[PDB]
Nucleic acid binder design. Structure first.
Ligand SMILES: [Zn+2]
Ligand SMILES: [Zn+2]
Ligand SMILES: [Zn+2]
Ligand SMILES: [Zn+2]
Lengths: 73, 74
DNA sequence: CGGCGGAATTCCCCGG
DNA sequence: CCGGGGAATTCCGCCG
């Protein structure tokens, strides 16, 4: 019944404050500590789902932050 | 000098599969044309393809390859 | 020779 | 951790 609030894939639980799948959990972790600067090839509104989440780390990371994901939480 | 890749605008290494392109776009088209051919765009299918952003959308990059006229028979 | 196709190699993101 | 797979550079075979 329950889905990841970022990519809509089935969630593994509440990670960093937000209900997410394992891949988004690990992605957000790597993004914050990598101090990554991502660039969208689109309009920064990109569709993020199970398949398309690979395409735009920028919009995926943005969705993580907007969903409320945080390292200390 | 110089000449630019007609796909991503990076410097072109020569004429590959009929079109002036960089090395990276050469091997990309090779992989894509023999691949699963299912690529999906997360955008509006207008995604900007340049040296920085060409990794982001295989679908749009492949489309630009085709539009530029790239083919295996060349 | 130089140009092109292409395989091989290296690098890195992704996800189980 | 690990393996899978794409990206891009490197290296080689062929031919005009
Ligand atoms: Zn997710
Ligand atoms: Zn995007
Ligand atoms: Zn190119
Ligand atoms: Zn696109």
């Amino acid at each position: 019944p329950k889905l990841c609030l970022v990519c809509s894939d089935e969630a593994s639980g509440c990670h960093y404050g937000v209900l997410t799948c394992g891949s988004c959990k690990v992605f957000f972790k790597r993004a914050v500590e990598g101090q990554h600067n991502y660039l969208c090839a689109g309009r920064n509104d990109c569709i993020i789902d199970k398949i398309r989440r690979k395409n735009c780390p920028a919009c995926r990371y943005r969705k993580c932050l907007q969903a409320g994901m945080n390292l200390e939480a």
